[PDB]
Design a protein around this ligand. Structure first.
Ligand SMILES: Nc1ncnc2c1ncn2[C@@H]1O[C@H](COP(=O)(O)OP(=O)(O)O)[C@@H](O)[C@H]1O
Ligand SMILES: Nc1ncnc2c1ncn2[C@@H]1O[C@H](COP(=O)(O)OP(=O)(O)O)[C@@H](O)[C@H]1O
Ligand SMILES: Nc1ncnc2c1ncn2[C@@H]1O[C@H](COP(=O)(O)OP(=O)(O)O)[C@@H](O)[C@H]1O
Lengths: 729, 263
C-alpha cells in the first residue's frame, strides 16, 4: 500500500479518481467504505473507484485530505479496505467556519443537498471538508454521531438545526500538525528523541528484548525562552499517544486538595488510555531546588508528583516529559535513576539552525527576491527561535510601518509583501537576544588554512585528538591512553584559538570556549559550582574540545593583590575526574607559562606543552590570503614585500594593518562620494598607497625581551640530549 | 489595579483578576492594564508566603488563557525591570519591552505648556529656561511646581474676603517659579539620563586630526552602512582617550553623538 500519489483534478470529496492496474495489483474493496491512514493517527474513510481520470499507480485524493494526513503533494498514499459498516442518520447540521457569510435557513438542506451524488459522507464525526453550493468554501465539524464508527448515513431523514458558527481554530488548537521537519533543525538531539520514543512508538514487541524501557522519564533541557511546547508536542501526532499537557502554574493556581485534583487524575486517565505520553510544562515552578522552596503546600505538591512518578506500573509505555530551564534548577531528588533519569539537551540553535529555522515561519509570506537568508542567519549570533519569530514579526510590522494608512481591507501590500534586505537588516538591528551570554555548542569555521604555522606541529595534534575519535583501535592493539589536554603558550594567542577552532572543524566536534574574564567572574563571585556545571554539560556535549583562554588571568589578578586558587583547583578536580574515554579534549592558552601552576606540569593531568613561535614571513602570505578572502583587495600588491617589511609583527598586528588599510579605503571612498555630491561607482579596488600608509601604524606589541624570555622557557623544553643513541635492535 | 486584587482575602484573589478576562471576552477590541504589577509579581524567593505564588501562578495561567481569541492587549506598570521575576517576562509570553525614561528640556517644556494651557499665566515668564534647568525632574513634579506657583499667586495676595480679584487673573512671576523650585525637591535624581545633550561642536577648537578620526568612528556606521560594508570589516568597537587632566570632563562625546542624533 506504499505508493506515490497523483495531483489534484477536482475540488470535491464526492468524486475521487482511480488507478485500476494498481488495484489489480493490490486488494481493495468496494467504493464508499475504504480506509486511508497516515499522519497524526488520523484514520479516514471516503470513496474510491469512481472517476478513473488519472493513470496507474497514482490516485487523486481530495484537498482537505491532502492537507490532512500528509504534508503536501508527492507523498506516499496508503489504502485499506474497511467494509461492512452500518448506516447513520443525518450527520452534521453544524458548520464551523463560514455560517455568517450567507444565510442559515434550514442549516443542512442549503449546502449538503446541491453538492452530492449519493455520497452520504463516511467521514469522521468531527472531521472537516469544504462544502457549500455557490461559494464552495464552508467546512464542518460533525456533532451528530448516530453511528459510532466510520459509517455512511441513510438518505434524508430529519434532525435538529442547532448549528452555530465558531472561529476556525479547533484543528490547530487540538490537532496541530507537527512533524520532524516542523522543528527548526534540532537533529543533533531530535534523532536522540526519536531513538528514545521508538520503543513507545506502538512497539510492545521489543520490550522483552530491552528488559526495562530506558525512557522511564525524559527531561528536556533548554535555555529559558527557546520554548518546549511544540518540541514536546512533536511526539504527539507522530506517535498518536494521548498528550494531555498540564502547566506548572496551572497546578500551582488551584488550592490544596484541588492541587492533587487534575494531577493524579491525569495519571489515572493515563492508565485509562493505552498510548500515553505525559508532558509537564515548566516543572521548576512545581519542583525547584529545595533551598529556594518555602512552606508546606509546595513540598506536599512535589511529594504528590514524586509519588505519581514512583507509582508508575511500567505498563503501556506511559512516558512523562518535562520542561527544564536548568537541571540544577529542579530538585536533585528527581535525578535518581529510577525515574526522570535520561536527560537530553535541546541547546541553542547555531547559524544553520538559524538558517532552516526560518523557512517554516516564512512559509506564509512572499520574499522580495532579495533575501538569501544567509545574511540574516549568522548576523543574529546568540539568538534563539523566539528571537527569530519576533524578528519576523517586527520585520513585517516595519513593512506595515512603511505602508501608509490607506487601507480598504487595499490589497497591494498585504497580498504581496515587500520585506526587503534593508527591512530585515533594520529588524536585525532592533533585536533583543535572550540567548546572549550563553556558551555555544556548535562547530565554528576556520578550516585549517587561516594561519599557516608549521603543519607537522599541528600534525602531532592531528594524531592526538582526531585519530582516537576516528580509530577506536588506535591504541587498543599495543598501547595506552593518549594525552587528555594540550596547552599552547607564548604570544597573545589569537591564533591558538584559530588552531583549536580548526581542530574542532576537522572532527566536526563541539567547541566550548571559556574566557579569562569568564573564569575571573567565578573567581570573584565565590560560586565554584558554575565550573562544575560547565564540565557537567560538557560531558553531555561529547565529543567536544574544551578551550580555556588566558589561564594565567588568575595569576595576573593575584599579582596585583600562592599560585593555586579556588577555580583552578576545581579545574584539576574535574579534569583529574575526567574519564579515560569519551574523547573530551582540553586546549589551553596562556601568555605567561611558568607562573600559573607548578602542578599543571605533572603527568596524570597533562604533559604536552607544545609552544608555537611568533608568526614569520611564511604565514604572512596566508594572513594576506585571509585578507584577500571576504574583502575586495585589488591586484598589483606585493605580498612578498609586505612580508619582507614585517620584521617582527604579530598576526593580530597584521590584521590591524588590514584594519588601518580598511579605514583608509572607506574614508577615501566616502570622501570621493562627498566630493562627487559636491561636484554639482564607489571604486572598491584597493591600491598600494593603503598598505604604504597603514605601515606607519605598525608597532610590535610583543616585547623583544619577551622572545628571550620565551626561549628561556624553552630551555626547560630543551632536553637532556647527548650521546647514547646506541642500537635500535 | 494590582493592589485591588492584593487587598482582597485568600481565595478572593481569583476574583477581580479573571473577571476582567472574561469581561474582555465581551469586547473584542480591548486592552488589559495592571497598575503596580511589581507588587503583584516580584521575585518568588523574595516573597515570604504562599498567596503571592498563587496570584503569580494564576496570572501566568490567565496570560495565555486568551490565546489569540479576543486579541486583547496586556500592558503593565513596572518601576524596574529587575523587580519583575524573569519567569514571567520570558520570551513569547509578556515580553515586549519598551521604556519611558525621563523627558528632556523640550519634553519638560511641552509638559509646561500642557499644564499651563488650562490655567492663566501672567504672560511674562519665559517658561523655556525654566524647563532647560530642573535636571532630574519628573513631570509630576512640574505639575507640583505649577501648583506651588498658583499657591504663591494666592499667597502674595493678603487675606481678602474670598472674591475673584486675584482668582480671575492668576499672576505668576519667574521669581515665584524659582522660589517654588527652591521649596521643592527632585525625585528623579541620581539616575542615568538617556537624553542627548547639546553643545553644537563649535566650542572645541583645534585637534583637527582628532576630529578626523572622531568623524571616522561614529558618524557613519548607520549613515553609511553599505559603504562601510564595501570591505566587509566590522566597525571599531572601542576607543580609549588619554592625556593631561585638562578640559576633559564631558561634552566631546556628547557633540560627536549630537551630529549623529544619537542618545
Ligand atoms: N527550535 C525551534 N524550531 C521551530 N520553532 C521554534 C523553535 N524554538 C522556538 N520556536 C517557536 O517559538 C514559538 C513559541 O515557543 P513555545 O510555544 O514557548 O514552545 P515551542 O518552542 O516548543 O513552540 C513557537 O511558535 C515556535 O514555532
Ligand atoms: N593568525 C592570526 N593571528 C591573530 N589574529 C587573527 C589571525 N588570523 C585571523 N585573525 C583575526 O583577528 C581577530 C582578532 O580579534 P580578537 O582576538 O577577537 O580580539 P580580542 O583578543 O580583543 O577579543 C580575530 O577575529 C581573527 O579573525
Ligand atoms: N573634551 C573632552 N571630553 C571628554 N573627555 C576628554 C576631553 N578632552 C580630554 N578628555 C579626556 O579626559 C581625560 C582628562 O579629564 P580631566 O580633564 O581630568 O576631567 P576634568 O575636565 O573633569 O578635570 C584625558 O585622559 C582625556 O583623554
Amino acid at each position: 500500500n506504499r505508493l506515490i500519489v497523483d495531483e489534484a483534478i477536482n475540488e470535491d470529496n464526492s468524486v475521487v479518481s482511480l488507478s485500476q492496474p494498481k488495484m489489480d495489483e493490490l486488494q481493495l474493496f468496494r467504493g464508499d467504505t475504504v480506509l486511508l491512514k497516515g499522519k497524526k493517527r488520523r484514520e479516514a474513510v471516503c470513496i474510491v473507484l469512481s472517476d478513473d481520470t488519472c493513470s496507474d499507480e497514482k490516485i487523486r485524493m481530495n484537498r482537505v485530505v491532502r492537507n490532512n494526513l500528509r504534508v503536501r503533494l508527492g507523498d506516499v498514499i496508503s489504502i485499506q479496505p474497511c467494509p461492512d459498516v452500518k448506516y447513520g442518520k443525518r450527520i452534521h447540521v453544524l458548520p464551523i467556519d463560514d455560517t455568517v457569510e450567507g444565510i442559515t435557513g434550514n442549516l443542512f438542506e442549503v449546502y449538503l443537498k446541491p453538492y452530492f451524488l449519493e455520497a452520504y459522507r463516511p467521514i469522521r464525526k468531527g472531521d472537516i471538508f469544504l462544502v457549500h453550493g455557490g461559494m464552495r468554501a464552508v467546512e464542518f465539524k460533525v456533532v451528530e454521531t448516530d453511528p459510532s464508527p466510520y459509517c455512511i448515513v441513510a438518505p434524508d431523514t430529519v434532525i435538529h438545526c442547532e448549528g452555530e458558527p465558531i472561529k476556525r481554530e479547533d484543528e490547530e488548537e487540538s490537532l496541530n500538525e507537527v512533524g520532524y521537519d516542523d522543528i527548526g533543525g534540532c537533529r543533533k538531539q531530535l534523532a536522540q528523541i526519536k531513538e528514545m520514543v521508538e520503543l513507545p512508538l506502538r512497539h510492545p514487541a521489543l520490550f522483552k528484548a530491552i528488559g526495562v524501557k530506558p525512557p522511564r522519564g525524559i527531561l528536556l533541557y533548554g535555555p529559558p525562552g527557546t520554548g518546549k511546547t511544540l518540541i514536546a508536542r512533536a511526539v504527539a501526532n507522530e506517535t498518536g499517544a494521548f498528550f494531555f499537557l498540564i502547566n506548572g502554574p496551572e497546578i500551582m493556581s488551584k488550592l490544596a486538595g484541588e492541587s492533587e485534583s487534575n494531577l493524579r487524575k491525569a495519571f489515572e486517565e493515563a492508565e485509562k488510555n493505552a498510548p500515553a505520553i505525559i508532558f509537564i510544562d515548566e516543572l521548576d515552578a512545581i519542583a525547584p531546588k529545595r533551598e529556594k522552596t518555602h512552606g508546606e503546600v509546595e513540598r506536599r505538591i512535589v511529594s504528590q508528583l514524586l509519588t505519581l512518578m514512583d507509582g508508575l506500573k511500567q505498563r503501556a509505555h506511559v512516558i512523562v516529559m518535562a520542561a527544564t530551564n536548568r537541571p540544577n534548577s529542579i530538585d536533585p531528588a528527581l535525578r535518581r535513576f529510577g525515574r526522570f533519569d535520561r536527560e537530553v539537551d535541546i541547546g541553542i540553535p547555531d547559524a544553520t539552525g538559524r538558517l532552516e529555522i526560518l523557512q517554516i515561519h516564512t512559509k506564509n509570506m512572499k520574499l522580495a527576491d532579495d533575501v538569501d537568508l544567509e545574511q540574516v542567519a549568522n548576523e543574529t549570533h546568540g539568538h534563539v527561535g523566539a528571537d527569530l519569530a519576533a524578528l519576523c514579526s517586527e520585520a513585517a510590522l516595519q513593512a506595515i510601518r512603511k505602508k501608509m494608512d490607506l487601507i480598504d481591507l487595499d490589497a497591494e501590500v498585504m497580498n504581496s509583501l515587500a520585506v526587503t534586505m534593508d527591512d530585515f537588516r533594520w529588524a536585525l538591528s532592533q533585536s533583543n537576544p535572550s540567548a546572549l551570554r550563553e556558551t555555544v555548542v556548535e562547530v565554528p569555521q576556520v578550516t585549517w588554512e587561516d594561519i599557516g604555522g608549521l603543519e607537522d606541529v599541528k600534525r602531532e595534534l592531528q594524531e592526538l585528538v582526531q585519530y582516537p575519535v576516528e580509530h577506536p583501535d588506535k591504541f587498543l592493539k599495543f598501547g595506552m591512553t593518549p594525552s587528555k589536554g594540550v596547552l599552547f603558550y607564548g604570544p597573545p594567542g589569537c591564533g591558538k584559538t584559530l588552531l583549536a577552532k580548526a581542530i574542532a572543524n576537522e572532527c566536526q566536534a563541539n567547541f566550548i570556549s571559556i574566557k579569562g574574564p569568564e573564569l575571573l567572574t567565578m573567581w570573584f563571585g565565590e560560586s565554584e559550582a558554575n565550573v562544575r556545571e560547565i564540565f557537567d554539560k560538557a560531558r553531555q556535549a561529547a565529543p567536544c574540545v574544551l578551550f580555556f583562554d588566558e589561564l594565567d588571568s588568575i595569576a595576573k589578578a593575584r599579582g596585583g593583590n600562592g599560585a593555586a586558587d579556588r577555580v583552578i583547583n576545581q579545574i584539576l578536580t574535574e579534569m583529574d575526574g575526567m574519564s579515560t574515554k569519551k574523547n573530551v579534549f582540553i586546549i589551553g592558552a596562556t601568555n605567561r607559562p611558568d607562573i600559573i601552576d607548578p602542578a599543571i606540569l605533572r603527568p596524570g593531568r597533562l604533559d604536552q606543552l607544545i609552544y608555537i613561535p611568533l608568526p614569520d614571513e611564511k604565514s604572512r602570505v596566508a594572513i594576506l590570503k585571509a585578507n584577500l578572502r571576504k574583502s575586495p583587495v585589488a591586484k598589483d600588491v606585493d605580498l612578498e614585500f609586505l612580508a619582507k617589511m614585517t620584521n617582527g609583527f604579530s598576526g593580530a598586528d597584521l590584521t590591524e594593518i588590514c584594519q588601518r588599510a580598511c579605514k583608509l579605503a572607506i574614508r577615501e571612498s566616502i570622501e570621493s562620494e562627498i566630493r562627487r555630491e559636491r561636484e554639482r561607482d564607489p571604486v572598491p579596488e584597493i591600491r598600494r598607497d593603503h598598505f604604504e600608509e597603514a605601515m606607519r601604524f605598525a608597532r610590535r606589541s610583543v616585547s623583544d625581551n619577551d622572545i628571550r624570555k620565551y626561549e628561556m622557557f624553552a630551555q626547560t623544553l630543551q632536553q637532556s640530549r647527548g650521546f647514547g643513541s646506541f642500537r635500535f635492535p
